[PDB]
Amino acid sequence: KELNDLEKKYNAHIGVYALDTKSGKEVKFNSDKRFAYASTSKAINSAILLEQVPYNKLNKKVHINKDDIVAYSPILEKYVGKDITLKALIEASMTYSDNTANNKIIKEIGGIKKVKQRLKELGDKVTNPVRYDIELQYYSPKSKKDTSTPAAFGKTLNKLIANGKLSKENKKFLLDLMLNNKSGDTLIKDGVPKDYKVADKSGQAITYASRNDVAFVYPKGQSEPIVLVIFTNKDNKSDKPNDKLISETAKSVMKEF
Numbered sequence: 001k002e003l004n005d006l007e008k009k010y011n012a013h014i015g016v017y018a019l020d021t022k023s024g025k026e027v028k029f030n031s032d033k034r035f036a037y038a039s040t041s042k043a044i045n046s047a048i049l050l051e052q053v054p055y056n057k058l059n060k061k062v063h064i065n066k067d068d069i070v071a072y073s074p075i076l077e078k079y080v081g082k083d084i085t086l087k088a089l090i091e092a093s094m095t096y097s098d099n100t101a102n103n104k105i106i107k108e109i110g111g112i113k114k115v116k117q118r119l120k121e122l123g124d125k126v127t128n129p130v131r132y133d134i135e136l137q138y139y140s141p142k143s144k145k146d147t148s149t150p151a152a153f154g155k156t157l158n159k160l161i162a163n164g165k166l167s168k169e170n171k172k173f174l175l176d177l178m179l180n181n182k183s184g185d186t187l188i189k190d191g192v193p194k195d196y197k198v199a200d201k202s203g204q205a206i207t208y209a210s211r212n213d214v215a216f217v218y219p220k221g222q223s224e225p226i227v228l229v230i231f232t233n234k235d236n237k238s239d240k241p242n243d244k245l246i247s248e249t250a251k252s253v254m255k256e257f
Contacts, residue, residue, distance in 0.1 A: 001252045003029045010245045012209070015231040017154035020257050021162050022224035027256045031151035034126075035231035036139035038203035040153070040214045041129065041146070042093045045105050046174060047160045048118050049086065052109070055169035058087040062104060071134050073100035094177040094201060099133035106132065122159050126152035139205040139233075154229040157214060162225055175199045175216065186243040187213040188228060191250035195220035204241070209234040211241035213250075219257065226257055 003014050015035050018027040053060070061083040069077055075092040076084070077100070086108065092101035109115055112129050119127050127148035130136070136146040148156075160166070161174065178199035189198040200215030210233045216225035230246050230253075 001248070003249060003252065006245065006248055006252070010242060011234065012241065012245055013233050013235075014245075014249055015150035015229075016249060016253060017150035017229045018226060018253050018256070019154060019158060020224070020226045021158060022222055025257070027253055028151065031154075032149045034144060034147040034149055035212065035233055036137075036146055036205040036207075036210045037127070037148050037153060037231070038137055038139075038146075038205040038210060038212060039097050040201050040203035040212045040229075041127075041136070042097065042102050042203075043174075043178065043201035043214060044127075044153075044156065044160065045102055045109065045115065046090050046093060047164070047166065048109050048115060049090070049105050050166055050170040050174060051160070051164070053086055055167060055173065058090075058173075059085050061085050062089070062108065064100070064104065068100055068104060070099045070103060070132070073098050076100035076104070090174075091177060094174075095181055095183075097183060097202075103132045119156065122156055124148075124152050124156040127156060134206075137206045139207040139210050141208065141233075150229045150231050153214065153231075154227050157216075157229070158227045162216060162227055178216070184213060184215070187246040188215045188217070188230065188250040190243070191247035192217055192254050193220075196254075199225075207237050209236075209239035209241035211243065211246060213246050217254070226254075228253065 016029040017031040064079040074096045089101045092098040130145040184200040184202040197218040203212035212231045214229045
């Protein structure tokens with residue numbers, strides 16, 4: 001199909017960047033337009049921490065209190081006044097999309113300031129982390145805050161996870177979480193061949209029907225993944241998105257590989 005066609009069909013904007021890490025073949029559609037990344041940034045935050053904490057040390061604990069709790073913290077709100085391991089912070093952020101775990105994880109890394117720096121180090125001069133959850137969820141087409149382009153996020157995900165400095169165990173750890181994440185089944189996992197394995201982290205901002213999905217897709221037969229970044233939005237602030245849009249964009253894009 002055509003993505004321009006999928007744009008008209010859904011009356012939505014599509015941004016796509018896909019890189020088959022075996023061949024280095026890229027597919028691009030509005031890959032340089034900025035979209036609110038929202039909760040897909042949880043996968044970047046998690047990987048940055050995993051670069052600095054060995055797998056055997058993930059049992060290390062951090063204290064959680066009332067001032068840490070932010071909205072929509074399905075797991076972490078039960079830890080008020082208690083301690084939690086870095087392993088469970090990552091599992092909560094990635095699987096349940098827990099905002100507090102993520103914020104805690106950003107704090108452990110050193111804060112936005114330190115996240116922003118590691119990005120520049122990877123050569124990503126586009127991804128712009130500014131606010132914490134959930135204020136990062138309030139998207140405005142007029143602001144660059146908490147946005148990235150599909151080409152930039154995509155490349156950052158490849159140098160961090162697919163071909164970065166993560167160990168075998170931490171990398172398996174991060175990826176299993178993304179393979180068993182039941183929250184992304186209506187997205188990229190919905191539009192790719194059943195033969196393929198999809199390890200994703202979805203996202204959805206509060207405004208402009210901003211719905212995203214970033215995944216590592218493993219074609220039956222290939223062990224190297226295809227990094228796939230699908231960002232979408234609409235023209236009105238209160239527009240609701242339709243998940244079938246990411247599903248169908250994934251279907252078409254996989255036809256290039």
